[PDB]
Design a protein around this ligand. Structure first.
Ligand SMILES: COc1cccc([C@@H](C)NC(=O)N2CCC(c3ccncc3)CC2)c1
Ligand SMILES: COc1cccc([C@@H](C)NC(=O)N2CCC(c3ccncc3)CC2)c1
Lengths: 366, 384
């Protein structure tokens, strides 16, 4: 009557009280209590003695980091690292992103991962890196994703002088990816080549959504709407064609000052060639917000003359042949990823603290 | 799925402590023990609360709660609460609902008894046990919704009838089988007595109030109990390690009260009663005015010995073949499906005439730090 409606809420995996969330709620509770200090309270000690045994079983059964073998580390970021991994049981290969709980609490920002998870879990988009499994332990959050063995576009740009044909393609794929993120009612903000990866067939998918909300690449307005992503597309196209970013400076303060002054501070080096159409398009993205391209939807971008080739159409671009198909030795060839160089947890508390509380609901099995 | 079948098994089993009801208790319990403006000074908490705030207020609306029922009359009062005759507002059906103050249970640190009580009533599938339909909770109380038993207790029966031996053969036999079922479940009642013996719509026995039931250890033993008259001597010396036979003592005492009229160790003081129970070898004689067969005398004496040679040590079967129980009225396999001695005649679906009327509350302090008052009540909630 009501109890149908209730059982609906428990079965919906978008709901914050799905079964995974409720078990997080239990494991989180136990972890924030099981310290010999807090077991001085009888209420706690009783409760813990009951659930002690069952929770230790649950942990065995739930997905955990010991289910995977780490092959190589392939990424490092603010709050953790990205690992190439093999699921021991299934033998399949994934990319797994880790996030230190200690660090996220300590340094202010510990909400970003919700949208990141949801985007990757639920986009059904071939422009988004799909999330398969999210889970957690005492120390870390984990996100198991489809590995993208073609690497980022920094790694592409460093290894190729990039012709205009290639840039038409990679740009077009970006404008499509963003339109999808926009269709989901999100602004990326931090659009850049490090957040642009290449699949087994050298086609684009986006990853790292830490910034999605409901320096060189940043827009003036940021220093407020979706148009700021489209700025960053202009900057990208420029870096591909020219070689440097269009507001490069020695200092960061220099870069900022240049971005503000963009009306004056943008000229195109005469030693690099670039078409009129391509010049025009970059300038159309690098205006003030009020008359920037992509305010009035995606379609005005799509019909811009620059994008005319006799190679692909907008509806079929991702199903055409990519510029650079990677050649890969095995299911673990991380040749398009540079190697990586090289931990403090919470204090044992005296009273109750609730460190695990902002991570209840994270766990997701697809 | 190798493991994740096994996991989803544990969540679907309603005997398991992490069924869906338990996990939601775990959530509601958490929120209640945190949502105080004092503890929201911790940011971790306040974030978490602001997320779940909205969904939890929805959940409460949908879950079973006390406002789903209308209270008709109070029909029982006991250590940690009361028993209410109630009507489910929606379905219109009538139940008996037993309440337990959370404050009181914590304060007077008996707060485990309800687990066996709930489990017994939920999961006996016995027609000797009062069935539990729904258990739920609020900030303040536990609730247990049971089949109402409009025939009342056997105190109320014994007070309104001189009880013949034919009737006592019946009511005793029904007790014998009821206890054997509780014994089959690996439990000792301890506090067996007429107040804990109720009568259905057809005047047949069911047991209720299991606050004293404790689970047997590997041998069949266990380590206050009960009202004094019905207690056994061995229970009084652990109270300075005892088995199932102590229930069977209380059966002897019951049979005596039915046939004689008074309890066999009555006294003015309680101390008097205790002293008599210890001295049972001497202090038990039968009033010469009292109408009672040799068989019935013999059987009472067989229950009221020292533990070591008491009847029902060596299973139920030796009791069942005792000659006393011979009649040409019922058999052991069909007793509960025969006509009861006293079928109640009831005016309405709410006739509590077989229940005496009753006479006519402090909650927790708002805490400064985290306290966890709701923690020992996680898992209670049960929808049948
Ligand atoms: C703040 O904490 C962080 C920790 C690690 C990484 C990051 C940021 C800097 N980058 C990502 O999150 N990325 C890019 C690589 C993606 C990838 C790489 C290989 N294969 C598949 C995906 C995974 C998402 C931040
Ligand atoms: C320690 O706290 C307590 C709180 C309340 C009650 C009690 C004890 C005294 N009695 C029960 O528990 N009973 C007897 C009546 C039963 C019944 C009455 C009508 N219809 C159906 C069942 C329900 C269980 C103790």
């Amino acid at each position: 009557s009501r109890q149908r409606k209730l059982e609906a809420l428990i079965r919906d995996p978008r709901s914050p009280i799905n079964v995974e969330s409720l078990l997080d709620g239990l494991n989180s509770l136990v972890l924030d209590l099981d310290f010999p200090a807090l077991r001085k309270n009888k209420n706690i000690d009783n409760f813990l003695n009951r659930y002690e045994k069952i929770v230790k079983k649950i942990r065995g059964l739930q997905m955990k980091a010991e289910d995977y073998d780490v092959v190589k580390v392939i990424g490092r970021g603010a709050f953790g690292e990205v690992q190439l991994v093999r699921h021991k049981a299934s033998q399949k290969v994934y990319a797994m992103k880790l996030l230190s709980k200690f660090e996220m609490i300590k340094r202010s920002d510990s909400a970003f991962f919700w949208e990141e998870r949801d985007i990757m879990a639920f986009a059904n988009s071939p422009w988004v890196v799909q999330l398969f499994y999210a889970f957690q332990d005492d120390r870390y959050l984990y996100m198991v994703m489809e590995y993208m063995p073609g690497g980022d576009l920094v790694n592409l740009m460093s290894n190729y002088d990039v012709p205009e044909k290639w840039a038409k393609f990679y740009t077009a794929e970006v404008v499509l990816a963003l339109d999808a993120i926009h269709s989901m009612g999100l602004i990326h903000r931090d659009v850049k080549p490090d957040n642009m990866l290449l699949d087994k067939h050298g086609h684009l998918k986006l990853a790292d959504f830490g910034t999605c909300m409901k320096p060189d690449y940043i827009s003036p307005e940021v220093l407020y709407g979706r148009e700021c992503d489209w700025w960053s597309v202009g900057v990208f196209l420029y870096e591909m064609l020219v070689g440097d970013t269009p507001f490069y400076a020695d200092s960061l303060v220099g870069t900022y000052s240049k971005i503000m002054d963009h009306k004056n501070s943008l000229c195109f080096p005469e030693d690099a060639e670039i078409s009129k159409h391509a010049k025009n398009l970059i300038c159309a993205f690098l205006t003030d917000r009020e008359v920037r391209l992509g305010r009035n939807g995606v379609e005005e971008i799509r019909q811009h003359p620059f994008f005319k080739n006799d190679q692909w159409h907008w509806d079929n671009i991702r199903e055409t042949a990519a510029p650079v198909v990677p050649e890969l030795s095995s299911d673990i060839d991380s040749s398009n990823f540079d190697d990586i160089e090289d931990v403090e947890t919470f204090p044992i508390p005296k009273a109750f603290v609730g460190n695990q509380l902002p991570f209840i609901g994270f766990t997701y099995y697809r």
